[PDB]
Amino acid sequence: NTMRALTLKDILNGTFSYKTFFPNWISGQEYLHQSADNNIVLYNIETGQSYTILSNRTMKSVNASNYGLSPDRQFVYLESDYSKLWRYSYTATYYIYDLSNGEFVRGNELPRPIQYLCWSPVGSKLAYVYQNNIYLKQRPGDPPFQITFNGRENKIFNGIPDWVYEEEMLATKYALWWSPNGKFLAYAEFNDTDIPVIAYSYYGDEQYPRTINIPYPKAGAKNPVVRIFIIDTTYPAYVGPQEVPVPAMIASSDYYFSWLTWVTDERVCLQWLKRVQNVSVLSICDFREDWQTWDCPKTQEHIEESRTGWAGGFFVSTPVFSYDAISYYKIFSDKDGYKHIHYIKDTVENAIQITSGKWEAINIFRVTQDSLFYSSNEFEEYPGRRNIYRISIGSYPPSKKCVTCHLRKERCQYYTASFSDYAKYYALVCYGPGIPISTLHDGRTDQEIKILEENKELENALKNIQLPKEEIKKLEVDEITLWYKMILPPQFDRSKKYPLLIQVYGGPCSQSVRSVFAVNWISYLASKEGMVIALVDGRGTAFQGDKLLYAVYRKLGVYEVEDQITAVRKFIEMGFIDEKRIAIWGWSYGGYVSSLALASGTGLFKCGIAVAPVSSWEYYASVYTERFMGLPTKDDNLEHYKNSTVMARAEYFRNVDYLLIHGTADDNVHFQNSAQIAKALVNAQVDFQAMWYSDQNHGLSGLSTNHLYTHMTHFLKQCFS
Amino acid sequence: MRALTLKDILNGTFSYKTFFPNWISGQEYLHQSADNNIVLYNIETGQSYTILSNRTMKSVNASNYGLSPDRQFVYLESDYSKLWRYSYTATYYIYDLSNGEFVRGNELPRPIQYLCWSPVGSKLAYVYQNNIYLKQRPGDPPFQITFNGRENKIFNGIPDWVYEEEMLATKYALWWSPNGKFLAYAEFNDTDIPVIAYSYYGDEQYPRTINIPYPKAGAKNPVVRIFIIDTTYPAYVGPQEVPVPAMIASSDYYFSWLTWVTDERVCLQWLKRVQNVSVLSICDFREDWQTWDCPKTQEHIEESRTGWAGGFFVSTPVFSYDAISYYKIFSDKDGYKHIHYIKDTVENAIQITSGKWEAINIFRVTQDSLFYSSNEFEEYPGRRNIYRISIGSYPPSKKCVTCHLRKERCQYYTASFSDYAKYYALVCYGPGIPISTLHDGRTDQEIKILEENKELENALKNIQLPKEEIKKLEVDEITLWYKMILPPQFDRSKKYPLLIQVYGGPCSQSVRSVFAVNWISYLASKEGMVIALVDGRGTAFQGDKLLYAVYRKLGVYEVEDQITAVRKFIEMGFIDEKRIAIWGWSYGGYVSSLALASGTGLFKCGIAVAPVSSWEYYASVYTERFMGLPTKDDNLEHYKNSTVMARAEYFRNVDYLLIHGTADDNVHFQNSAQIAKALVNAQVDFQAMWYSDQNHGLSGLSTNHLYTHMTHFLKQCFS
Ligand SMILES: *[C@@H]1O[C@H](CO)[C@@H](O[C@@H]2O[C@H](CO)[C@@H](O[C@@H]3O[C@H](CO)[C@@H](O)[C@H](O)[C@@H]3O)[C@H](O)[C@H]2NC(C)=O)[C@H](O)[C@H]1NC(C)=O
Ligand SMILES: CC#CCn1c(N2CCC[C@@H](N)C2)nc2c1c(=O)n(Cc1nc(C)c3ccccc3n1)c(=O)n2C
Ligand SMILES: CC#CCn1c(N2CCC[C@@H](N)C2)nc2c1c(=O)n(Cc1nc(C)c3ccccc3n1)c(=O)n2C
Ligand SMILES: *[C@@H]1O[C@H](CO)[C@@H](O[C@@H]2O[C@H](CO)[C@@H](O)[C@H](O)[C@H]2NC(C)=O)[C@H](O)[C@H]1NC(C)=O
Ligand SMILES: *[C@@H]1O[C@H](CO)[C@@H](O[C@@H]2O[C@H](CO)[C@@H](O)[C@H](O)[C@H]2NC(C)=O)[C@H](O)[C@H]1NC(C)=O
Ligand SMILES: *[C@@H]1O[C@H](CO)[C@@H](O[C@@H]2O[C@H](CO)[C@@H](O)[C@H](O)[C@H]2NC(C)=O)[C@H](O)[C@H]1NC(C)=O
Ligand SMILES: *[C@@H]1O[C@H](CO)[C@@H](O)[C@H](O)[C@H]1NC(C)=O
Ligand SMILES: *[C@@H]1O[C@H](CO)[C@@H](O)[C@H](O)[C@H]1NC(C)=O
Ligand SMILES: *[C@@H]1O[C@H](CO)[C@@H](O)[C@H](O)[C@H]1NC(C)=O
Ligand SMILES: *[C@@H]1O[C@H](CO)[C@@H](O)[C@H](O)[C@H]1NC(C)=O
């Protein structure tokens, strides 16, 4: 064979895709996995042997795409008829299979379509959502008991989140949680009745288009109301569902429900977040026997507030409880402003700092009897790497071990972990910089037992490909460090002038300079079209302390734009960039940033591309916008909501080539955002190129993705030649 | 001295003025002068006086006026709020001219959808919240005629969306009798019609949905009931329904138009939903029952075995002074639309005009004369000349008033007649600079020049305008008339890039002797391009064989005829076969898209502005007229085969530019949304542009942006 450059076709077909192995743990030494001919194999690590538990002929009999083994292993649910709704939500038909009998569960059949379904943590209890209502099945073939009755489509939601909670708050399709032993079922009740709706046309394949209404609260609009209830699953008819008391300081004004964490069958932990998202409350509630309800004392309310910015990051960090079920470990900012692990027993005041330094603790994976596992930046001071650490708890001389630092140093510096029951064994998934690799380790010695997915097919395929060189370096301008990823063309010469493309996102709590392997569009642009690509992380980006993160608080569309400009000026003075041929592209938040950078009036960028951009913070969800911007009122931050729009910079797009793209059925960043930019450019008498994608979601999935990346390539090749 | 610039076209620098007198009597007319005073001019005693001052108009921000026939009052129209093509809502103020003060009292409500005076006296008729009200005297409390008017459902006195656009082409649906004794009105019911919903972004946090009851091809149609009310005693017997003919009511139907003959005689025109047959029913008033009798003996059928009834509309009759007979334009034995004279029956109709040319419109039927416009002169179908023929005199007369009035300059006319045709005005639209003159209605002599356009004549002195030529091609027994616009200092030895401007819809004509300084004049004047406009099968005024050729076969012959013409223009030697383009709007957007995806390799690039993509998405009134019903028993097969989306894979080696306004109520954005979706599925690249919150015509700074964007696309395509 002969070495060849990447093609656009290779990227669109996903020829250089990688496989990942996350074991579906069922016990401390057992896990499930789908085989090549679609069977379900049960691998036991201690015994070393595997067996088929659910055959391909049983899955094909009902056109099943997914499965779910019950904890007691008596039954397995068969998921078929997947019908996607929003980012996480989907509807499906569920078939219970009796493994012990060798036949499907016939009788009090499950309805269709089911919005969410799950087993209890022990036994064969079932909980499901149908027509925004929760139902309970003690045994698979038993008639269901209806828990909720007010569920109405697009108005009252039970057991599943509404649009805004699914997207910006919970980031999941469910809103119900079983207690550790299935004694209680906790759930949430969302009321979207008075929220204004977003309406958009869906053309489809019928003579007339249909309107799609979604209750969506834009910045400052009426928000949904939430009521968390806990019902006794053993005797639901006795006292019924009990509402969980909301803390006095949370209920004083509008509030959000952050997350629910079960501690024991008689103790649950709820997190609340005031509408002004700079103060969160961790309330611990205990079950009482004299009232059959949940008592929430003032003594068990732990406040976490941020005087500089917002509480947490994308979410308010969840606590990981100790074996004693009274104390917990949580990640939050220290005195210096770095998000580190703390240990809280009684009160927040007496919290003990577990990790410290000019780096951040990202996630706590497991809190065992003697070990604590977590991921961090620490290794070699690179904020874009992720490594797994293991620290001792309770032992007199403490231990601290980096499991993955030197596991495969050159190839692997971005890991994630998946723990078996009680951390007896665990799996590490390496995502880059090299070819991703999934391995399985002993939970006591950290030793690698076997390679789950090595990716030898992708390694051989890439042999004859001229992949670009990726470099993660930093710039130090005016006490502000800018980390950047530069993608260089094959056979790169520091004496030549290369056209430059900037890929931007820059949204608060984000990070785009990571040691992650990816064979994407910008890899093709550097491999075949000889372009230099750059990704810069400035103010507002996460994992480098709160001074960097909270710098964009109430000032969106200002520093993230300036930092891309500062970086381009620095890349130009390196000598290998053609100052005449520079471009910037982005999607969503990156579409807002590239539009503002292109209309900055600096003359650095020749052309720019904005895909589904945000044009004004008055058009985005209250949950995201108000977290980083505040209220759009005269008494608060209305002034900056008006000054931070793309439409106010319309006259500045006169000598630059602008390409504006947006999907007509975008439920997340509505088409209204691009419709307003286009209207402002028309009024300003400014020429630009545009593209719409009919009936397409925010991500433009399908043949639209092909068309988009082809259309953008044509625009860049014209701009650069 | 200098070439035209895009800015000159966008600003309307080379615009022309037109003078249509607002007749009030047989020798008088009103006109809003330079200082915005309403002046009255008398032709006989050549005197003028200001009847409504600029101070009176400015006091209520008035943009329009309406003098009552008795001249006691004048309505002052202000707060104009456009709705659809013709409809608008405004505030009206009655001014008492005799007293010198505004009419105080039972004030008119706001906003009023339509308002008009009776043909005599001070009677008022107006539509408010889809209901008709009557004011005997301006300061009197109104008498409510209708009560069922509900927004977007029941319409009274005004048409619904589809009747306003495709059927009446007017903002009103009420007609006063010749002396104001009776008021006739329409009642439209859109209750079960499916609606078209589209987002209107506006300037608020959330966009709003706009719903319009719009019947697409084959969908449920609005129902119509016509009534007549005695305006002297409307409480006595009330509104009486006009009997619908037995053969019209048998299935779905349309009300075509209403024509008052005398106070006690009215003429109604009906159209069957299968638009190949129309009925002219004459109804008389009966004292005995105070109702309208419509006999079978007074039903005149007009059917078309080859195609549809009429042109864009079913021609209206013009009655004689005897009020029993009438003159109507329709096809003869040979297939040419000529004037006929009907006394008793359609069978015994007498053909008034004949030949291989068409009579376009009947302007006025007087006691001894008949005025009409036609093609006849020098056999040019794109010309309009006004003729006068005698009626009643033993040896008949026939003269062409306009033919040699100004032969080189003027060959496209229109006429505005004063009360009883005592005087009339001729408006020349081209080929030369438009001119409006005033003629004596008895001798046809020119009395004065109303608007000569000397400002535009002087402005164009230093402008080297392109040469326009109207010629014809004769291929396979089919004559194609074309207008070619040549660059200044055109050389027949050089190769020039070619742009085709297309419309090609049924009943249309784009090769006319009309003066215009438009976008394509700039493209030829500054960008050295040859421009062409071809009229093939489906275009009107050349007989029914040409017109009905596209019957039930839309998107086929009009496309082929543009291709046949380009092949002929190429073999002329001065066209660069490598640089050819085609642009069109609306129907022209459908034709240019199909021509670009024909697979002939003639066109390099094409532009489609607000195109129709499938006949499933367009108005039933227009679509089922030339294509029939989209059912298995009728023409569903061709409805499916005549789509732009079915030709998606053919746009692969051509440059396509697709433009469409998001708030287009006429040709919905759905049409372009479907084309874009098909091109994505076919993996075909194209350039696109949307216009937020803009109507079908993209009026305002959106026009500026569109014409600029299209110029860039063509400049790039022709380099
Ligand atoms: C846009 O087009 C309009 C015409 O539709 C232009 O308005 C006209 O501009 C010309 C030249 O500036 C004016 O002509 C001069 O008028 C004076 C009397 O006012 C006369 O003494 C001169 O001999 C000459 O004819 C004209 O008055 C003016 N207005 C009208 C009603 O025609 C306008 O200027 C164009 N815009 C641009 C930017 O060119
Ligand atoms: C508007 C907005 C917004 C903010 N936002 C969020 N949040 C948190 C989660 C909830 C969400 N509502 C808001 N997640 C995001 C982004 C974002 O702009 N981009 C850029 C981006 N996005 C996409 C889709 C891209 C696709 C291709 C290339 C680069 C891309 N870059 C992202 O990638 N992700 C994952
Ligand atoms: C779909 C469709 C359609 C049919 N249509 C109608 N009818 C009768 C009245 C009722 C209506 N529903 C249907 N009037 C039309 C057209 C049409 O295609 N074009 C072409 C055109 N249109 C526009 C707007 C143009 C603008 C610029 C240049 C060329 C243009 N060429 C016209 O000019 N006019 C005046
Ligand atoms: C699209 O990409 C897939 C891989 O994602 C290609 O399929 C592979 O083809 C090679 C050919 O040697 C096989 O050995 C692999 O086993 C295939 N992998 C999978 C996952 O099927 C496919 O060929 C690509 N499409 C095209 C047209 O090249
Ligand atoms: C307007 O049209 C609607 C629908 O065609 C009429 O309503 C129907 O009238 C019939 C007869 O009175 C009833 O039996 C139906 O149940 C009605 N259907 C609906 C959908 O309402 C309505 O009466 C008409 N109104 C006028 C004033 O003509
Ligand atoms: C008017 O047009 C209609 C079209 O629907 C003609 O009706 C057809 O007549 C035949 C007679 O055998 C029927 O079988 C069909 O169902 C009808 N439609 C078609 C096109 O198949 C009607 O005859 C025409 N009338 C006139 C006077 O020309
Ligand atoms: C939901 O909210 C509406 C409107 O605010 C209110 O009327 C109703 O009581 C609520 N319903 C439930 C079940 O919470
Ligand atoms: C939280 O935000 C509000 C509004 O900006 C501010 O007034 C308040 O003091 C902040 N609270 C803390 C603890 O920072
Ligand atoms: C508005 O925003 C611009 C940046 O887009 C900034 O330069 C200006 O100072 C802001 N403030 C006001 C009051 O305009
Ligand atoms: C109003 O008309 C008078 C008389 O023609 C004139 O003098 C005056 O200038 C006009 N005012 C305006 C505003 O045109």
Properties at a glance:
homodimer, alpha+beta, 8-stranded mixed sheet, 5-stranded antiparallel sheet, 15% helix, binds ligand 356, binds a molecule of 2 linked components (NAG-NAG), binds 2-acetamido-2-deoxy-beta-D-glucopyranose, transmembrane helix (chain A)
Could you please describe the fold and organization of this structure?
It is classed as hydrolase. Keywords: FAP inhibitor complex DPP4 linagliptin, hydrolase. It forms a dimeric assembly. Structure of human FAPalpha in complex with linagliptin. Chains A, B are Prolyl endopeptidase FAP. 2 copies of one chain form a homodimer. The two termini of chain A are 31 Å apart. The longest helix of chain A has 17 residues. In chain A, helix 9 packs across helix 10. Chain A is globular, with a radius of gyration of 26 Å. Chain A is built from 14 helices and 44 strands. In chain A, strand 14 and strand 15 form a beta hairpin. Chain A folds into 2 domains: 466 residues, no CATH class; 255 residues, no CATH class. With 721 residues, the first copy, chain A, is an alpha+beta fold. In chain A, the strands form 10 sheets. An 8-stranded mixed β-sheet of chain A has the order 37-38-40-39-41-42-43-44, with helices on both faces. In chain A, strands 13, 14, 15, 18 and 19 form a 5-stranded antiparallel β-sheet that branches. In chain A, strands 20, 21, 22, 23 and 24 form a 5-stranded antiparallel β-sheet that branches. The interface between A and B is large, with 44 and 45 residues. The structure holds a molecule of 3 linked components (NAG-NAG-BMA), ligand 356 (2 copies), a molecule of 2 linked components (NAG-NAG) (3 copies) and 2-acetamido-2-deoxy-beta-D-glucopyranose (4 copies). The site of a molecule of 2 linked components (NAG-NAG) has 4 residues of chain A, from loops.
